[PDB]
Amino acid sequence: TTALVCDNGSGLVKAGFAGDDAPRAVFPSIVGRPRHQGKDSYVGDEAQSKRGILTLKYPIEHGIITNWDDMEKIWHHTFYNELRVAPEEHPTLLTEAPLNPKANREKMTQIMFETFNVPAMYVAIQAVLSLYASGRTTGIVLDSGDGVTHNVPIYEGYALPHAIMRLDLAGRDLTDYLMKILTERGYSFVTTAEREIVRDIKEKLCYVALDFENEMATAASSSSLEKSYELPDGQVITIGNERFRCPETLFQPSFIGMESAGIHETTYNSIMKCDIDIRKDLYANNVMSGGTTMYPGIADRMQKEITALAPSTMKIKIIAPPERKYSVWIGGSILASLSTFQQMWITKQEYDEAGPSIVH
Amino acid sequence: DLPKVAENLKSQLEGFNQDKLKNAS
Ligand SMILES: C/C1=C/C(=O)O[C@@H]2C[C@@H](CC[C@H](C)/C=C\C=C\CC1)O[C@@](O)([C@@H]1CSC(=O)N1)C2
Ligand SMILES: Nc1ncnc2c1ncn2[C@@H]1O[C@H](COP(=O)(O)OP(=O)(O)O)[C@@H](O)[C@H]1O
Ligand SMILES: [Mg+2]
Numbered sequence: 055t056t057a058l059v060c061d062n063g064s065g066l067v068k069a070g071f072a073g074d075d076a077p078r079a080v081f082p083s084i085v086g087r088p089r090h091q092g093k094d095s096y097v098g099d100e101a102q103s104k105r106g107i108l109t110l111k112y113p114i115e116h117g118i119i120t121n122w123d124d125m126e127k128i129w130h131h132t133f134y135n136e137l138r139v140a141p142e143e144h145p146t147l148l149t150e151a152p153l154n155p156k157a158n159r160e161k162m163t164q165i166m167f168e169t170f171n172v173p174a175m176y177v178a179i180q181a182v183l184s185l186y187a188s189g190r191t192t193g194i195v196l197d198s199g200d201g202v203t204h205n206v207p208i209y210e211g212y213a214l215p216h217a218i219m220r221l222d223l224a225g226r227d228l229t230d231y232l233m234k235i236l237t238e239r240g241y242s243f244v245t246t247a248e249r250e251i252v253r254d255i256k257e258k259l260c261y262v263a264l265d266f267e268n269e270m271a272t273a274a275s276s277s278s279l280e281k282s283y284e285l286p287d288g289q290v291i292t293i294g295n296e297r298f299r300c301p302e303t304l305f306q307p308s309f310i311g312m313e314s315a316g317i318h319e320t321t322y323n324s325i326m327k328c329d330i331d332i333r334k335d336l337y338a339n340n341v342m343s344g345g346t347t348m349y350p351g352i353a354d355r356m357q358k359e360i361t362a363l364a365p366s367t368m369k370i371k372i373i374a375p376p377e378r379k380y381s382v383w384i385g386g387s388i389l390a391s392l393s394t395f396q397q398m399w400i401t402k403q404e405y406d407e408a409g410p411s412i413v414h
Numbered sequence: 415d416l417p418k419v420a421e422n423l424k425s426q427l428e429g430f431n432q433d434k435l436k437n438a439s
Contacts, residue, residue, distance in 0.1 A: 187432075387435065392426045
């Protein structure tokens with residue numbers, strides 16, 4: 055029948071069916087369990103509503119699944135509650151973060167077949183699905199989500215693992231950063247509940263500056279960059295340089311006390327780590343994906359930082375599709391919908407015969 | 415034997431008209 059596509063995000067799970075232009079369900083990648091009197095599980099929004107009597111967990115904190123009991127809860131919810139289907143009836147395409155350990159990929163496969171009894175299954179790299187979504191098989195993706203951000207160079211459809219760059223900094227950290235400066239200005243943002251207020255402020259008012267210093271000076275000598283936000287308690291916090299200082303972190307991690315390279319540098323390094331005979335293709339196809347790549351000005355800023363690092367001859371092109379927030383999912387949707395892809399679904403017959411290592 | 419599958423798959427991805435994709439919602 056129809057294939058299922060589940061993008062297991064570190065912050066949000068995007069789920070739906072292959073052939074759709076968008077994910078039917080997108081919910082918080084969280085699982086809550088009864089806290090006292092030692093049902094007995096809640097996923098997504100529900101888990102959040104009832105935080106008061108549950109202990110929440112993040113099974114995919116930084117892109118990698120670290121808790122299998124919890125993950126079984128996400129997938130159960132996805133299937134039966136969100137999509138409302140019997141997993142045994144549909145082949146399932148699952149996405150995984152770049153550099154996911156083999157044993158991890160094998161346990162995901164073990165669960166799908168033994169726990170959810172799916173007829174067929176497949177595991178693809180998120181970044182690669184995003185490139186696919188843009189109509190390319192070669193290119194270099196910059197995927198910045200909630201818990202982690204990756205640089206993934208891809209040639210003829212295959213990711214180049216040795217050149218993959220990882221930055222443990224994404225949207226979640228951008229929110230924690232803005233939350234910090236805001237609490238310092240006097241507005242109390244502490245609880246996770248409250249943090250959701252800041253996150254929303256982030257998404258609606260933050261942007262990337264083409265030149266941090268020029269922008270910084272404008273904010274200091276004018277009020278033309280000021281925007282206002284009404285808090286749920288009625289207060290009207292207004293912000294200026296924190297509007298672009300927050301995202302600036304992606305380019306300068308030191309704002310968060312990290313000595314790691316910024317996203318423009320990690321992209322350059324990832325390129326330079328690749329066969330010199332394909333660097334032009336990468337440079338010409340830098341595709342951005344993920345919710346943290348939605349900031350206004352991020353594309354222009356990348357184009358500037360990269361042209362400055364690469365050789366003057368080089369043609370630098372940054373691709374940032376409007377559906378950026380769902381490129382991965384859409385990549386899987388397109389893939390798992392193809393005709394020629396059907397010979398790719400690891401089947402239970404194959405799994406029952408060779409084992410979990412059949413996935414590689 | 416299977417590279418032809420991948421090969422053809424790569425072709426199907428490069429020529430895929432993103433529409434023809436059921437409008438979710
Ligand atoms: C519309 C929305 C989008 C989103 O990205 O949610 C994800 C998931 C969410 C789960 C925890 C919260 C309390 C419970 C329910 C949230 C529901 C909807 C929030 O934790 C994030 O907020 C974190 C915190 S601060 C940040 O930058 N990411 C990202
Ligand atoms: N319009 C926006 N501007 C800035 N950030 C956004 C926007 N929309 C979503 N985000 C952020 O993107 C992050 C997670 O994106 P996503 O790639 O979907 O998650 P995974 O990382 O896949 O769960 C969050 O930190 C969220 O706040
Ligand atoms: Mg993701």
